[PDB]
């Protein structure tokens, strides 16, 4: 069995399962997005996948990025019927600077890069080609629902 | 197999929906109308019980639309097999303290503004009874016996 | 049908499957960590597991802790080939105190316990041995990727 991947642009990058021990496929950003404190965005990956029916994709966060930054990704559930552009549902959860601006910006590693503008402190800049998320595909059970008045089994 | 038993617990409850055979989960609806102000938490009653078979888990989780377009944050709940109680949606309005700013309207799960009966704080969401708020995705699980060891041995692939 | 578990210290505790009908294994903290508003930390469990290839661990939250407190755990993905100390990626999401301090601290149950110092309000204290998270293991599909110009059946 094989999983079809379709690159939707020149900025897209084939997801990578580097190590046979890895559970997921490394997902890359396909755009450069500046994300200020408390701001939400959907980072385009320019990647389409054709997941077979009987599975679900979990487009989810990386432990490193999650633990070292205020970038919060909401785990996306990829259906078999979705052949469109995979988006990373992200938010910069840092508190508003209320004024403090510095000539640098934070990256997904937590380190500081030189920036084109003097932007608010706690601003992250997601660069094109960044390992931003991972895709873990798991089998699903999708039976038919039967309404009963009582079950036949026993916070 | 190929059947999941569902119990509607009240007149406000609504049968979960698998719209498309291509969908991975079942859409879950709210069984109550809840006003939720900034930074407030609640557990939304669905008035729905399910009987998940042994060897599986339910993931009561968010919808991408609601999550991306609003400040409504659902913490993905893990529904165990043998759990026949009311499924609750673990929700929080993650909007910032609106200070004193109040408007005659409230936000819905779509992000749009509705006219309200009271003048509430800006960023207040109102979850309406019957709203498609979350989805239930059922996944198989591995629940082996645990063996404490001093050192790990290699293991064959699944 | 067995999973290898290694306890890495005296503070460690064997994960427990609560009713045996349950899907995950309750994980306990092996350390005492005081966590103030908006602070992030990785709570050591001092427990290693060897999950075989073809599975993923979901180190995720408990509904009680999650719904009753401001403690936010990001679900960690435990790969096969990770045989190290399992860490709980946690954050006290309580709002920045205005400067308010009380002689007590909040617990993972939401109740107030007396602490040795007068700390900021909304500060949580995770105690050694606290049932903090659970581990749910699910099978995974890791096929080979084939790039296409257009999708087929
Ligand atoms: O909360 C966590 C998350 C991950 N882990 C482990 C499991 C996983 O195998 C490893 C991190 O893997 P991820 O892919 O989730 N993040 P990252 O890509 O940053 O780590 P690495 O560079 O090693 O691949 O650390 C924990 O112990 N606790
Ligand atoms: O973050 C993402 C990115 C993409 N997607 C893709 C994959 C999925 O199949 C599709 C819709 O997923 P949801 O069911 O979570 N969105 P929603 O329920 O709000 O609307 P709809 O089901 O009508 O698309 O969009 C996400 O779900 N989350
Ligand atoms: O959001 C929800 C809604 C319902 N439930 C149900 C299903 C689950 O079987 C039951 C308990 O789930 P958890 O183990 O994750 N929470 P907790 O550990 O606090 O409760 P318990 O002591 O029963 O294990 O509550 C959730 O877990 N999360
Ligand atoms: Mg990784
Ligand atoms: Mg949907
Ligand atoms: Mg539990």
Q: Which residue bears the tokens 């029916």?
A: A53
* C-alpha distances out from residue B35 to B38, B99, B146, Å: 10, 17, 45
Nearest-neighbour CA in chain B from A93: distance (Å): 10
**How do B72-74 and B88-93 pair as beta strands?**
antiparallel
Dist CA B54 CA B40 (whole Å): 35
Residues 6+ apart with CB under 8 A from A128: A11, A29, A30, A31, A32
Q: Which of C7, C23, C82 to mutate to test the interface with B (most CBs of B within 10 A)?
A: C23
Dist CA B80 CA C23 (whole Å): 6
Phi, psi angles (nearest 5°) of residue B5 = -75, 130
Atom of ligand 1 nearest to the CA of C84: 27
Dist CA C23 CA B112 (whole Å): 38
Please count the structural domains in chain A.
Answer: 1
Q: CB–CB of C95/A42 below 8 Å?
A: no
Cα three-residue angle A93-B98-C36, rounded to 5 degrees: 45
The backbone region for C10, taken as left when phi is positive above 0, alpha when psi lies in -120 to 50, beta otherwise, is alpha
How many C-beta atoms surround the C-beta of residue C84 within 10 A?
10
Count of CB pairs separated by less than 8 Å, A with C: 95
Quick check: C61 contacting B, CB < 8 Å? yes
Question: Domain range holding C53?
Answer: 1-153
* C-alpha distances out from residue B41 to A101, B36, B131, Å: 32, 7, 18
H runs (alpha helix) in chain B: 64-69
Dist CA B59 CA B78 (whole Å): 5
Q: Which residue of C has its CA nearest to B90?
A: C67
Write the residue in A74, A146, A150 that is nearest to B67 by C-beta.
A74
H runs (alpha helix) in chain A: 63-68
C138 Cα: distance to centroid of ligand 1 (angstroms):
17
Token pair for B149: 């060891």
End-to-end CA distance of chain B: give it in Å, rounded: 23
Q: Verify whether ligand 2 is closer than 6 Å to residue A40 (CB atom).
A: no
Q: CB–CB of C35/C130 below 8 Å?
A: no
How many C-beta atoms surround the C-beta of residue A89 within 10 A?
19
- CATH number for the domain spanning C78: value is 2.70.40.10
Pick from C64, C62, C59: nearest CA to C45: C59
Pick from A123, A60, A120, A66: nearest CA to A92: A123
- Tell me how far the alpha carbon of residue B93 is from its chain's centroid: 13
Q: Verify whether ligand 2 is closer than 6 Å to residue B65 (CB atom).
A: yes
Quick check: C1 contacting B, CB < 8 Å? yes
Q: For residue C113, what is the enclosing H or E element?
A: strand C112-120
| Experiment used for this model | X-ray
End-to-end CA distance of chain C: give it in Å, rounded: 36
């Amino acid at each position: 069995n094989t999983l079809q991947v379709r690159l939707l642009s020149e900025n897209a990058r084939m997801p990578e399962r580097n190590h046979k021990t890895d559970a997921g496929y490394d997902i890359f950003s396909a755009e450069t997005v500046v994300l200020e404190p408390q701001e939400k965005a959907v980072i385009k990956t320019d990647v389409a996948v054709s997941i077979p029916e009987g599975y679900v994709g979990l487009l989810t966060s990386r432990s490193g990025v999650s633990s070292k930054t205020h970038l919060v990704i909401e785990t996306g559930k990829i259906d078999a019927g979705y052949h469109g552009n995979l988006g990373i549902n992200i938010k910069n959860n840092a508190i508003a600077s209320n004024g403090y601006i510095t000539p640098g910006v934070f990256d997904i590693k937590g380190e500081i890069d030189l920036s084109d503008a003097i932007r608010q402190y706690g601003t992250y800049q997601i660069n094109e080609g960044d390992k931003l998320a991972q895709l873990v595909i798991v089998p699903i059970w999708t039976p038919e629902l039967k309404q009963v008045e009582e079950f036949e089994s026993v916070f």
